[PDB]
Amino acid sequence: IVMTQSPSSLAVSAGEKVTMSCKSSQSLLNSRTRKNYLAWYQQKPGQSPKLLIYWASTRESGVPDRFTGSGSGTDFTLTISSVQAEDLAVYYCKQSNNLRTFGGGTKLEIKRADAAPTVSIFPPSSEQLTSGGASVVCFLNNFYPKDINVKWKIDGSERQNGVLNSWTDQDSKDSTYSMSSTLTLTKDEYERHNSYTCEATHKTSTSPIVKSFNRNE
Amino acid sequence: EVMLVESGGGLVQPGNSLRLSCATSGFTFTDYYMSWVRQPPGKALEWLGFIRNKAKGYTTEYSASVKGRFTISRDNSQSILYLQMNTLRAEDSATYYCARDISPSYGVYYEGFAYWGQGTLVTVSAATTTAPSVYPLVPGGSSVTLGCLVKGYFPEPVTVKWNYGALSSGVRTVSSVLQSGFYSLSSLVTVPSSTWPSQTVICNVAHPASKTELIKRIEPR
Ligand SMILES: C=CCO[C@@]1(C(=O)O)O[C@H]([C@H](O)CO)[C@H](O)[C@H](O)[C@@H]1O
Ligand SMILES: [Mg+2]
């Protein structure tokens, strides 16, 4: 049996209703038990999946009213009446009428009001420098939306090589993102220059947020 | 209290084999079918197979994708489930979960995986197991943001805790990045300036594949 889910992902604002679909290539209705063998699981980032709905429409112990499973045969749906911040997760349907098969999942994301990042810059530690490396980190905290740009400048000149960027998952409490931008040099590279600057550009303003430091301080 | 705990994860060379274990307690083991599920990083869950309960004769079934390559068995005296993996390739790199399946022959029967283990990460690579280096992130107002930069480890994953788990609010941990065969990430925490440096802030960085934990106390410049 092939399971297919839709959409692959979607974003809604808190308080809004959401509908996700799950289709199977064969009927999941067991004629003997007269039940649809389809389950919905919730998997939050970094966590194991958690059973929400079984037999297509029955809610597992502890799961809130807000989650409703429906459908029969080959077409199934998971409805969330009012999505909240804790709902950030991928939702998987799973047939168990013939062995078991998981759908491809639907990622639920949250839309929220735009928010500017708080920007911090961190010079390299002495223990890294001692080992001959110099990582400079620009941290952008609690912003939205996700897309954001960091420009690095050394002694006033832009620097593109040696930079790595990485985002957090959407925050389960306030729906914001954070990201780090790391410029990695050798100790010698680092000690050849003085001024280190990172500029954060985000839709929350025309002007970039600029943070800097001087190696000789 | 139902418990499922997977072990045996880590780095394995391509072509080699690996046995996973899943220790259980808090229920009558022999009453339940037991399933294995895996999940490649950033991908969907995939059911691999199950072994049935005692009433059904502990018979095994598997998905097409792993038929003839993955094998399942159970020690009914110790209540331990196993997954035997053979001829592993990079595509098999994934988190492997065990899950309690149905008990249709005694007690409460409903179709679903009521309990799951925490999962164990297997990565199939010809590379080298290397513990991370941990560096403090400290500034050059009413709040201060600190953290640890974790670099040069392999394979995944690492977990970062603050003050041995006692500092949990305002924690941000960015996803790992792979560059030149090594992983790195950074974890940061924001606390009131009245708490640091006047009080202790420490990050604990655990790297399961090397059985290593590193501590880094955050000190002022
Ligand atoms: C006591 C019946 C067990 O029946 C099993 C089984 O073992 O094979 O089969 C059931 C099918 O619906 C039968 O058509 C379910 O898949 C069930 O989960 C289980 O896999
Ligand atoms: Mg068979």
Side-chain angles (χ1 to χ4, degrees):
Chain A
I1 303 183
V2 179
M3 302 299 300
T4 194
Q5 290 182 248
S6 203
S8 71
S9 78
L10 72 162
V12 304
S13 307
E16 294 183 354
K17 176 178 176 171
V18 65
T19 289
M20 312 173 199
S21 301
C22 169
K23 193 151 191 301
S24 59
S25 58
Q26 302 183 52
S27 173
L28 308 188
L29 180 61
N30 184 320
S31 65
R32 164 176 40 104
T33 56
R34 299 226 282 163
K35 287 164 193 287
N36 291 97
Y37 287 22
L38 180 94
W40 288 94
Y41 297 85
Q42 180 192 61
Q43 184 179 209
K44 301 182 179 177
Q47 293 180 196
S48 302
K50 165 190 182 183
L51 179 64
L52 297 193
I53 306 289
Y54 60 94
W55 286 330
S57 68
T58 298
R59 209 183 318 119
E60 177 67 303
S61 308
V63 182
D65 261 37
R66 312 162 32 237
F67 294 93
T68 304
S70 62
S72 192
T74 63
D75 289 23
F76 301 91
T77 299
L78 178 60
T79 302
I80 306 178
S81 63
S82 174
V83 323
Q84 264 71 24
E86 331 89 69
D87 299 342
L88 262 19
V90 181
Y91 295 82
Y92 296 98
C93 70
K94 190 212 67 192
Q95 73 86 19
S96 65
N97 197 33
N98 183 177
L99 308 187
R100 292 87 173 86
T101 312
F102 288 94
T106 292
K107 185 177 184 184
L108 179 53
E109 313 200 75
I110 285 175
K111 268 209 268 55
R112 60 147 287 148
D114 291 346
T118 295
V119 186
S120 301
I121 188 159
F122 301 98
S125 66
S126 56
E127 47 260 70
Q128 187 185 202
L129 288 168
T130 282
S131 64
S135 289
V136 193
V137 177
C138 188
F139 182 59
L140 289 53
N141 207 190
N142 304 326
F143 59 85
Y144 187 91
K146 185 174 182 182
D147 201 13
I148 194 168
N149 300 261
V150 171
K151 178 189 295 181
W152 282 94
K153 287 179 192 171
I154 306 180
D155 283 339
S157 309
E158 182 180 6
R159 219 321 210 303
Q160 322 198 47
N161 298 142
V163 178
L164 300 168
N165 300 142
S166 184
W167 277 255
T168 60
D169 293 304
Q170 197 158 23
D171 187 77
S172 287
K173 321 223 73 74
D174 71 1
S175 309
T176 64
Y177 292 94
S178 297
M179 73 81 73
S180 66
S181 177
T182 307
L183 173 59
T184 294
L185 315 167
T186 70
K187 168 172 164 287
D188 293 312
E189 277 179 319
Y190 180 60
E191 292 177 326
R192 282 202 290 271
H193 303 277
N194 210 257
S195 175
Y196 290 87
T197 305
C198 93
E199 313 180 340
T201 288
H202 193 250
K203 72 175 285 190
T204 35
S205 183
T206 329
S207 51
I209 297 169
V210 184
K211 294 287 171 182
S212 284
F213 74 88
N214 293 310
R215 186 176 48 82
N216 66 1
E217 319 213 53
Chain B
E1 180 202 48
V2 160
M3 289 273 83
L4 267 46
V5 181
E6 300 92 343
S7 297
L11 180 68
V12 48
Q13 309 300 132
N16 279 8
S17 287
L18 183 63
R19 192 186 86 195
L20 299 188
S21 63
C22 169
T24 81
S25 67
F27 63 98
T28 308
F29 189 61
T30 69
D31 284 338
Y32 289 81
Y33 291 39
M34 297 292 302
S35 278
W36 285 97
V37 182
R38 77 176 177 184
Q39 183 173 44
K43 303 285 177 159
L45 300 166
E46 177 185 24
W47 181 80
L48 304 166
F50 67 35
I51 181 158
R52 299 193 171 84
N53 61 2
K54 185 176 180 174
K56 301 289 192 182
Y58 299 125
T59 49
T60 52
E61 312 285 354
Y62 311 99
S63 59
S65 67
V66 308
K67 275 181 322 195
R69 212 161 56 90
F70 288 16
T71 266
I72 292 173
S73 70
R74 59 192 297 166
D75 186 331
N76 295 130
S77 72
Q78 297 201 64
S79 300
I80 300 176
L81 174 76
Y82 298 99
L83 174 64
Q84 169 72 23
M85 300 179 283
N86 293 310
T87 314
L88 291 165
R89 347 98 150 188
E91 302 97 284
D92 300 311
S93 298
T95 300
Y96 290 74
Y97 301 97
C98 59
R100 203 183 73 171
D101 204 317
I102 57 161
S103 54
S105 312
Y106 183 75
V108 175
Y109 169 51
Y110 62 98
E111 283 289 337
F113 298 168
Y115 298 95
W116 296 66
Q118 80 286 167
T120 184
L121 183 68
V122 183
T123 130
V124 189
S125 153
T128 294
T129 298
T130 130
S133 302
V134 181
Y135 307 116
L137 292 168
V138 287
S142 59
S143 83
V144 62
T145 297
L146 315 159
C148 295
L149 167 62
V150 190
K151 326 224 334 291
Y153 68 88
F154 194 92
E156 289 200 287
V158 301
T159 62
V160 177
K161 285 151 182 43
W162 291 89
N163 285 359
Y164 297 90
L167 216 200
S168 56
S169 308
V171 170
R172 305 285 185 264
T173 300
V174 298
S175 308
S176 61
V177 319
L178 175 63
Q179 189 207 45
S180 312
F182 298 92
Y183 284 99
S184 62
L185 56 69
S186 81
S187 172
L188 298 97
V189 63
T190 293
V191 305
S193 49
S194 64
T195 291
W196 184 93
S198 63
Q199 295 161 220
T200 310
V201 176
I202 296 174
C203 78
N204 310 80
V205 179
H207 186 243
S210 67
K211 306 286 172 283
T212 298
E213 252 216 38
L214 301 176
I215 101 164
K216 177 59 60 172
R217 167 160 192 169
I218 306 297
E219 303 281 347
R221 290 182 194 263

